[PDB]
Amino acid sequence: EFAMRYGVESIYQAMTHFACLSSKYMCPGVPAVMSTLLANINAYYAHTTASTNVSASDRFAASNFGKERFVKLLDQLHNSLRIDLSMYRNNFPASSPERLQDLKSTVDLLTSITFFRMKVQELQSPPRASQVVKDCVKACLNSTYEYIFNNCHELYGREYQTDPAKKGEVPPEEQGPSIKNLDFWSKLITLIVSIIEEDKNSYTPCLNQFPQELNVGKISAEVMWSLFAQDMKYAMEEHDKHRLCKSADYMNLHFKVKWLYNEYVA
Amino acid sequence: RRFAKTISNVLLQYADIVSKDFASYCSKEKEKVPCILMNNTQQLRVQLEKMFEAMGGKELDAEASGTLKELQVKLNNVLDELSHVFATSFQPHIEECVRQMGDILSQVKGTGNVPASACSSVAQDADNVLQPIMDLLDSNLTLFAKICEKTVLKRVLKELWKLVMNTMERTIVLPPEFLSKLKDHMVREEAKSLTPKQCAVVELALDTIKQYFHAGGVGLKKTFLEKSPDLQSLRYALSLYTQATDLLIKTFVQTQSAQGSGVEDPVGEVSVHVELFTHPGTGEQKVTVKVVAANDLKWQTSGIFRPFIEVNIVGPQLSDKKRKFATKSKNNSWAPKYNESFQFSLSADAGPECYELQVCVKDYCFAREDRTVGLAVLQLRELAQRGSAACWLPLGRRIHMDDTGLTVLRILSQRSNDEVAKEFVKLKSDTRSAEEGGAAPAP
């Protein structure tokens, strides 16, 4: 009634409410609403009346919300989405399906923004959503890799160890690499597997928007193996100097690495 | 800056002069003097904070301030050391006390079938058990609570609490002679466990000691005492003494994680191929074990060698299940091939990480006895990832263990009528009958 009495067009109301929602975008379901809302704001400026001789970007420059304002709003939001997606595992734990759906809709919103940049702003080279997300996933995977690589024993102890007395806080240098024993690496491999599987199983189905460009399980395997492989390569070089573990242990590690590689990487 | 050095030099030289004589005052006739010296030390810290603040506190020069903050931490640590040195002069008395508490608790057993001086109430037995230490504690803690400043008292009490908890753990709950009397070979006695009644009594003596050390808030916070790792460790050891056979066995498999990372001084090896099947027909777990061969068996014997390979599964809930298989024997063959495939069932409930294969090579000997050549452990946690594994298990002479394996084992050996415990204890207590290639391994 305020809007109808005072001539405020529906698209202004929407771009305003989208601006409100953009502050609360972390909140459950909001990214779906925002994605939908932006697909509508998009459809409004993009498609409405082909009988016009004006670009979608110029018709959008005739927005009473302000083109600039909405462009900036979308950029800030896109950045906030990039940040949260750069910790997607932590910020959208697999133990919450709804947070996985918010993750999905967070990406669907990022797509809707990129699509709005492409269609309404008529931008010639918007940062491709699939790529933006892939980078976020890489950033998260790096931070994940660091996390597991710092917390290896706690994580492994808890998740796989059949004797409870071994589940606890073994030293940071064994929740990280040791020259005396390979056990960190064995445990790290199983955690890398657990992460790759979580990515394959939870996050890849969740993030199916760009199936031909984004497979989270592939990216997880690639990054996790890469990080692991650099580290493992330095570590094996280091073990090759010291030779403190037995021949057999490196053979067992070799079998595990072979298996890991051949299962997920080959 | 110049003056902060003066302060530091003087006050550390005080702290030092005191610290040097401190132990000489920690003798039983002068208990007050250590308390007073601790209070002096602490009074230095207090007067130093005053003096730091009088020197402008936050507005003091950075190196002068740094000097005095350093000094305050050093002095704090002196007070901690003095508190420890003080608490330590009570250690022999705490040990004597706790040994007496142990002499009293030996007279309490599983008393629902014992006379009313030991089926005396759980409370009265706890009080009797406690009496040696409560003569010490009541008097001393009430004296210290007076003559120690509250910072001094708390530090003294933490050092005494730890000392009591550890002494009780060592002297009462895990007495080294219970290695001898049913972990070890020394006596065919049932050892007598900590019986439910002596588990109680102790758990109540401990709540009383905790209340004593709490002293209605005058001593240590209930929160420090409950979170006390010393207490938690003591409670853990106690919890083991009543735990069910399967739970003890699960605990063994989950804790003995190192029984799956290289035998030291091997006596041969066994090639196995193993397939965990999260049984595609049931969602139980079944364990196929293809015994391929053995090799390098250190058993060039005084006769016809006739090796066969026993395979055993180990873990919880196996009473209803075939725990053992064996290959055929092979005549005169230190590298016998078998190619024999066995199929254990695990439980449905307990995951593969609750289980381990134990692979034993034995010489078949009619008229005599089938000599253990060697033993290997494979942890099925590994196979929980691997699904199927080819592996050459090195064979040992005995399985290598930690304190908790050895504690669980000495606990299970007291369950000397439980058939699962009997067979578990027997199975872990199997070692290579030494001969034809050697007695004791490495871990």
Side-chain angles (χ1 to χ4, degrees):
Chain A
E1 280 296 338
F2 190 103
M4 288 183 297
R5 193 176 196 259
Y6 303 137
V8 180
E9 72 273 29
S10 60
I11 186 65
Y12 183 89
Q13 307 190 51
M15 292 173 81
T16 300
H17 188 44
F18 183 83
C20 311
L21 292 183
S22 80
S23 67
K24 299 290 194 180
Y25 79 95
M26 311 85 68
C27 312
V30 177
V33 183
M34 287 200 73
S35 180
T36 300
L37 180 52
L38 184 58
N40 282 276
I41 290 162
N42 182 90
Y44 177 92
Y45 292 110
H47 309 312
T48 62
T49 62
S51 54
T52 58
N53 299 286
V54 179
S55 77
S57 187
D58 294 325
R59 177 163 52 262
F60 171 53
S63 182
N64 300 302
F65 192 83
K67 161 161 177 193
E68 2 57 29
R69 180 195 180 181
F70 203 71
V71 169
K72 293 157 193 187
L73 179 74
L74 289 164
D75 296 338
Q76 296 144 11
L77 175 60
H78 172 273
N79 177 47
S80 300
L81 296 166
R82 175 90 99 161
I83 290 155
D84 291 358
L85 295 166
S86 303
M87 282 313 306
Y88 75 80
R89 194 185 310 287
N90 299 38
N91 296 337
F92 303 109
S95 60
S96 177
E98 306 327 311
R99 286 273 281 286
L100 295 180
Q101 181 52 49
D102 293 326
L103 173 53
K104 188 183 201 88
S105 297
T106 295
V107 172
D108 302 337
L109 177 56
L110 196 151
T111 75
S112 295
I113 294 160
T114 302
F115 185 67
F116 182 94
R117 289 162 166 181
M118 198 84 78
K119 286 301 201 174
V120 174
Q121 303 163 243
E122 295 159 324
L123 280 157
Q124 301 80 4
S125 311
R128 183 69 197 303
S130 57
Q131 195 54 64
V132 172
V133 173
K134 193 158 190 176
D135 316 328
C136 305
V137 166
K138 287 163 173 194
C140 195
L141 286 163
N142 279 280
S143 299
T144 304
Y145 178 90
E146 151 265 296
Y147 167 60
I148 71 164
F149 197 84
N150 279 274
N151 297 270
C152 170
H153 198 95
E154 165 256 283
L155 288 157
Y156 187 101
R158 186 174 57 275
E159 187 176 321
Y160 330 97
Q161 205 77 76
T162 61
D163 179 358
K166 287 112 177 182
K167 300 199 159 194
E169 297 313 318
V170 145
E173 303 176 6
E174 296 286 353
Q175 316 233 11
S178 186
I179 199 73
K180 266 280 187 174
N181 73 83
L182 307 179
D183 322 341
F184 166 71
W185 299 106
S186 278
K187 291 186 177 187
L188 187 72
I189 288 161
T190 312
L191 294 162
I192 288 159
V193 167
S194 185
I195 290 299
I196 291 165
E197 281 296 318
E198 187 182 68
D199 290 327
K200 189 183 83 177
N201 301 337
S202 300
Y203 293 103
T204 305
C206 174
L207 302 186
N208 65 341
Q209 292 89 348
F210 341 86
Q212 29 59 284
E213 298 171 49
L214 189 90
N215 178 309
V216 194
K218 287 186 200 176
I219 298 154
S220 185
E222 176 166 290
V223 173
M224 295 278 286
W225 176 270
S226 297
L227 292 173
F228 170 83
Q230 289 128 23
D231 292 1
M232 176 47 70
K233 177 183 187 152
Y234 117 64
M236 279 252 79
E237 289 165 14
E238 206 55 32
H239 288 290
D240 195 12
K241 299 152 206 174
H242 294 86
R243 293 275 185 130
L244 292 156
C245 322
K246 294 177 186 173
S247 57
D249 311 334
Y250 311 112
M251 302 282 275
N252 293 335
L253 184 64
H254 195 359
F255 280 118
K256 290 152 202 188
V257 170
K258 183 205 176 192
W259 180 85
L260 171 68
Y261 182 80
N262 292 43
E263 175 53 29
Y264 289 105
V265 190
Chain B
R1 287 183 308 160
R2 175 61 198 101
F3 194 61
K5 295 155 195 190
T6 306
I7 291 160
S8 184
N9 292 340
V10 171
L11 291 183
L12 292 169
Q13 182 181 44
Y14 190 114
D16 185 45
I17 287 162
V18 167
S19 299
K20 280 167 169 172
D21 294 324
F22 190 82
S24 80
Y25 304 122
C26 294
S27 70
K28 293 180 182 177
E29 327 73 14
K30 305 99 185 179
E31 323 91 307
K32 318 92 189 170
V33 175
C35 302
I36 296 160
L37 293 176
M38 286 195 69
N39 302 324
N40 296 350
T41 303
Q42 170 54 9
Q43 181 67 350
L44 315 189
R45 288 185 63 242
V46 173
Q47 284 286 351
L48 177 58
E49 282 168 352
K50 290 178 179 185
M51 202 128 204
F52 171 37
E53 300 7 311
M55 290 171 74
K58 313 97 182 181
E59 283 53 67
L60 183 55
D61 168 86
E63 300 99 82
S65 187
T67 300
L68 301 181
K69 287 163 178 185
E70 146 256 285
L71 176 61
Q72 187 63 341
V73 171
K74 284 188 300 199
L75 294 174
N76 169 85
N77 306 341
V78 171
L79 195 69
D80 297 336
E81 291 139 42
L82 297 179
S83 80
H84 186 69
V85 175
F86 185 69
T88 296
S89 74
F90 300 92
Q91 174 149 12
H93 195 324
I94 289 161
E95 287 158 344
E96 176 51 46
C97 285
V98 175
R99 201 279 283 87
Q100 295 190 22
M101 300 163 64
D103 305 322
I104 299 160
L105 185 70
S106 76
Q107 305 165 47
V108 188
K109 296 297 203 182
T111 66
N113 306 96
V114 181
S117 62
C119 213
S120 145
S121 69
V122 184
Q124 285 148 336
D125 283 355
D127 291 334
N128 289 339
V129 165
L130 286 171
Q131 196 56 58
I133 201 163
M134 290 300 174
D135 298 337
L136 169 72
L137 284 164
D138 188 29
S139 183
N140 282 266
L141 279 44
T142 310
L143 173 64
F144 303 161
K146 198 282 168 292
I147 72 180
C148 296
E149 183 178 328
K150 304 313 180 177
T151 307
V152 171
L153 178 69
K154 290 160 187 180
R155 290 165 190 228
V156 168
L157 287 173
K158 285 193 177 182
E159 299 283 1
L160 291 175
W161 162 258
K162 168 175 59 176
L163 170 50
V164 173
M165 290 276 109
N166 297 348
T167 305
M168 291 180 73
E169 187 159 34
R170 180 179 60 248
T171 302
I172 301 174
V173 183
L174 300 176
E177 58 264 41
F178 181 34
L179 302 168
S180 315
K181 236 171 191 173
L182 245 188
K183 202 269 277 163
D184 308 345
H185 312 285
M186 302 202 189
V187 189
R188 213 246 90 127
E189 173 53 320
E190 314 316 316
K192 201 63 158 183
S193 59
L194 301 180
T195 61
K197 185 84 190 308
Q198 291 165 291
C199 302
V201 177
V202 175
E203 292 277 18
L204 185 55
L206 291 168
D207 199 353
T208 307
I209 290 164
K210 180 185 75 190
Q211 292 150 35
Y212 250 77
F213 268 94
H214 183 53
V218 182
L220 299 174
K221 309 98 178 185
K222 298 181 189 178
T223 57
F224 166 93
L225 300 165
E226 283 296 336
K227 294 166 189 181
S228 162
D230 328 79
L231 185 64
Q232 289 160 343
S233 188
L234 187 42
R235 285 164 170 176
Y236 187 61
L238 289 166
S239 79
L240 319 186
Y241 265 105
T242 54
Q243 276 154 13
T245 299
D246 296 278
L247 193 53
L248 284 165
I249 289 173
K250 177 177 179 186
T251 299
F252 191 106
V253 182
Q254 290 188 318
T255 57
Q256 302 323 276
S257 54
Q259 299 173 10
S261 59
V263 169
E264 214 83 33
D265 189 39
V267 298
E269 59 175 359
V270 186
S271 184
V272 300
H273 189 73
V274 183
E275 308 101 310
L276 177 55
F277 48 148
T278 290
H279 183 209
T282 66
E284 300 161 304
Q285 295 199 324
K286 305 288 174 165
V287 186
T288 302
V289 182
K290 186 178 178 182
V291 186
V292 184
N295 189 50
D296 298 325
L297 297 178
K298 289 183 188 170
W299 199 272
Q300 283 274 2
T301 187
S302 62
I304 310 176
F305 186 34
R306 305 173 209 91
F308 68 95
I309 308 195
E310 199 181 67
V311 183
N312 304 277
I313 184 65
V314 185
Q317 328 95 358
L318 296 178
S319 51
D320 56 350
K321 283 183 289 294
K322 184 168 175 174
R323 279 218 271 181
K324 177 268 171 75
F325 287 78
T327 66
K328 298 169 181 179
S329 60
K330 288 298 186 180
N331 297 294
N332 210 259
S333 170
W334 301 273
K337 288 54 169 186
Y338 295 106
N339 298 287
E340 293 178 58
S341 294
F342 309 142
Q343 288 80 10
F344 302 91
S345 298
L346 307 192
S347 191
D349 43 42
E353 77 304 316
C354 303
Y355 297 89
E356 64 198 3
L357 287 163
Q358 178 168 341
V359 178
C360 179
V361 182
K362 299 225 183 188
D363 190 3
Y364 179 58
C365 316
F366 39 51
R368 314 177 63 283
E369 40 71 69
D370 295 356
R371 290 248 212 79
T372 301
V373 181
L375 311 96
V377 189
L378 171 56
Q379 297 301 316
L380 305 194
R381 81 152 72 175
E382 297 170 53
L383 276 154
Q385 307 135 80
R386 302 168 75 175
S388 68
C391 181
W392 290 355
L393 300 183
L395 291 163
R397 312 179 196 274
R398 65 156 274 211
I399 299 169
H400 330 302
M401 288 249 273
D402 72 28
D403 61 85
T404 298
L406 298 160
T407 298
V408 168
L409 184 72
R410 83 193 77 149
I411 287 169
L412 286 174
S413 70
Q414 298 171 131
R415 305 163 89 82
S416 41
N417 292 288
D418 177 328
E419 300 306 321
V420 183
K422 277 167 166 186
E423 167 60 7
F424 178 90
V425 170
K426 189 64 270 178
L427 177 60
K428 297 316 188 177
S429 300
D430 195 315
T431 71
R432 175 189 174 109
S433 45
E435 54 263 75
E436 330 309 344

